[PDB]
Structure 1
Amino acid sequence: PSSDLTAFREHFAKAKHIAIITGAGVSAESGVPTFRGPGGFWRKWQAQDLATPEAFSRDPSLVWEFYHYRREVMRSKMPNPAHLAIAECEARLGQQGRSVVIITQNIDELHHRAGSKHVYEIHGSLFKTRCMSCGEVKANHKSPICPALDGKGAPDPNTKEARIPVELLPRCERKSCNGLLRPHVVWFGETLDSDILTAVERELEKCDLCLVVGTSSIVYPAAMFAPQVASRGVPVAEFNMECTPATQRFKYHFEGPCGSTLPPALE
């Protein structure tokens, strides 16, 4: 793939419908882990203990402890130059009748903190709950999310004594429910929201330029979004610190930290 930023910016000058796909690499520089990078969440912990439906049925406290920890860390984190370049791009293009849409894998909400509006959160949100009984979805920004989690840090599955009884974990505050809440996120083996997925699909059919920023292009279906668009002849530009399973499908690859590689692309 080309690293000709001039040639890419020519495609950028002519695009009316830009699709920007993002993963944890776009948030790294804000000072939070990725999933599979060094010090990543799935390096430190085993994903099958924390991010599957079975994980949650077998040990909802361990799982909640991990999402609680992440919520408490993320509160004070700020959008980095890559988030900010994306937001300013959307606002600038939007003012001229051109569309920029963000299709994010990240649940951290940092694209909303930056001022981005057209944001599909395809794996849910760190800050939303879903009730296991009634199905109610809610923003929840209580700190701590429940009293029993107050002052809990990152969980060790071997410290059985740190586990909280299930009745003291976050419960639905809807009058007459009290069901157990789970994070409103998409785990391995769970379908993505079909409304979201459908809308994303149409965005990808309409886009005339696609960027793929800070994702390992391992996890499906997100990993095939940009490959799909490229199979229609649309230019895709990858921004990543390394090559991925998908790089050889794309017209451009811009190597480096997105904090520095992305802002001149979007200028």
Structure 2
Amino acid sequence: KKDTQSITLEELAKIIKKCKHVVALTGSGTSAESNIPSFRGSSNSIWSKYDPRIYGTIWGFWKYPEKIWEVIRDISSDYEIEINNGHVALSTLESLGYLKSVVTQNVDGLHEASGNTKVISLHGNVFEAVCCTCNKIVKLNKIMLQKTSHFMHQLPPECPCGGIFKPNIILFGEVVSSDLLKEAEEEIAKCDLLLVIGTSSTVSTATNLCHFACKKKKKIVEINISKTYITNKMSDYHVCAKFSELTKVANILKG
């Protein structure tokens, strides 16, 4: 427990200006304004439409591997998924020489698409698939994820060997690999500021990385439309703002 003081976007800017190695921790909050639904119970959740028991678990995948591809296929095709100002904001913060890494739980690859250089994907990424028998990795893209694509024509997509392609994202019942977790630890260890942007709703890999940050005495700044699990627990400051309002911050540090 500790005191988390609310500050303003312009106050945050003043904090960042002094720092030299900023890391951003990002969850579904950073993608909401790109029309990507969340994956918990946040009202804007994907689980309105699909049963998580069947569509989101490894044992659900083992028995009905097509279903998670229906999910991915539908989202890619039916929603106007594009970069938002927050992503442009972050990208320019990296261009300005302050933001060094982004550890994300998002599977949409938007940070990278924004022009950030070092993106650690805790929950994997929807643009890789892996054959479940021969381990062939195939890198995908928007076009191959479309409902009319050849790749999507027969579900589940099949490897040349005859095996079944699994999307390279963490499902319910899978743990994040140790080495990926360490890459995230290693980046936080050497940071002088941590932005927890649009995440920490609930205990998760991200919460634990925030705890790690406290243990390492790192200044934490929370940017979120609401309070969260780490507020008055591990975060030092809180900025109540939507992700896209970060352009307010990028503009100031540009001048």
Q: TM-score range by the shorter chain?
A: 0.7 to 0.9
Q: Say whether 1:220 aligns with 2:204.
A: yes
Q: For 2:35 and 2:149, how far apart are their aligned partners in 1?
A: 25
Shift of 1:72: 2.6
Q: Which whole-Å deviations, capped at 9, do the CAs of 1:220-252 have from their partners, x for residues lacking one?
A: 222221232133321111111111111112111
Q: Indicate if the aligned counterparts of 2:24 and 2:99 stay in contact, CA closer than 8 A.
A: no
Shift of 1:263: 2.8
Q: Which whole-Å deviations, capped at 9, do the CAs of 1:90-114 have from their partners, x for residues lacking one?
A: 1111xxxx55200111111111221
Which residue in 2 is equivalent to 1:153?
A: none
The structure 2 residue matched to 1:12, chosen from 12, 16, 36, is 16
Q: Which whole-Å deviations, capped at 9, do the CAs of 1:105-130 have from their partners, x for residues lacking one?
A: 11111112211111111111112111
The 3-state SS of whatever aligns with 1:16 is coil
Q: Indicate if the aligned counterparts of 1:212 and 1:237 stay in contact, CA closer than 8 A.
A: yes
Q: Indicate if the aligned counterparts of 2:198 and 2:224 stay in contact, CA closer than 8 A.
A: yes
Q: Which whole-Å deviations, capped at 9, do the CAs of 1:186-237 have from their partners, x for residues lacking one?
A: 1122122333222111111111100011114425222221232133321111
Q: For 2:231 and 2:209, how far apart are their aligned partners in 1?
A: 13
Relative to structure 1, is the Cα distance of residues 200 and 216 closer, same or farther in structure 2, using a 3 angstrom cutoff?
A: closer
Q: For 1:257 and 1:8, how far apart are their aligned partners in 2?
A: 14
Relative to structure 1, is the Cα distance of residues 99 and 114 closer, same or farther in structure 2, using a 3 angstrom cutoff?
A: closer
Q: How does 1:126-137 map to 2 (within 5 A)?
A: 126-137=126-137
Q: For 2:75 and 2:203, how far apart are their aligned partners in 1?
A: 21
The structure 1 residue matched to 2:52, chosen from 42, 47, 52, is 47
| Unmatched segments (≥5 aa) in structure 2 | none
Amino acid corresponding to residue 128 of structure 2 in structure 1 = K
**Comparing 136-145 and 63-72, the one that deviates more:** 136-145
| Unmatched segments (≥5 aa) in structure 1 | 151-163
Which residue in 1 is equivalent to 2:190?
A: 206
Which residue in 2 is equivalent to 1:254?
A: 239
The structure 2 residue matched to 1:2, chosen from 5, 13, 16, is 5
Q: How does 1:16-95 map to 2 (within 5 A)?
A: 16-36=20-40, 37-73=42-78, 77-93=81-97
The structure 1 residue matched to 2:173, chosen from 184, 189, 195, is 189
Count, aligned residues? 242
RMSD: 2.2
Relative to structure 1, is the Cα distance of residues 122 and 22 closer, same or farther in structure 2, using a 3 angstrom cutoff?
A: same
Return structure 1 stretches of 4+ with deviation > 4 angstroms.
145-150
Amino acid corresponding to residue 250 of structure 1 in structure 2 = S
Relative to structure 1, is the Cα distance of residues 52 and 81 closer, same or farther in structure 2, using a 3 angstrom cutoff?
A: same
Shift of 1:138: 2.1
Q: For 1:178 and 1:144, how far apart are their aligned partners in 2?
A: 22
The structure 2 residue matched to 1:232, chosen from 207, 216, 222, is 216
The 3-state SS of whatever aligns with 1:60 is coil
Sequence identity (%): 29
Q: Indicate if the aligned counterparts of 1:20 and 1:103 stay in contact, CA closer than 8 A.
A: yes
Shift of 1:88: 0.7
The 3-state SS of whatever aligns with 2:88 is helix
Q: For 2:93 and 2:237, how far apart are their aligned partners in 1?
A: 19
Q: Indicate if the aligned counterparts of 1:240 and 1:256 stay in contact, CA closer than 8 A.
A: yes
Shift of 1:73: 4.0
* TM-score normalized with structure 1 length: 0.82
Which residue in 2 is equivalent to 1:172?
A: 159
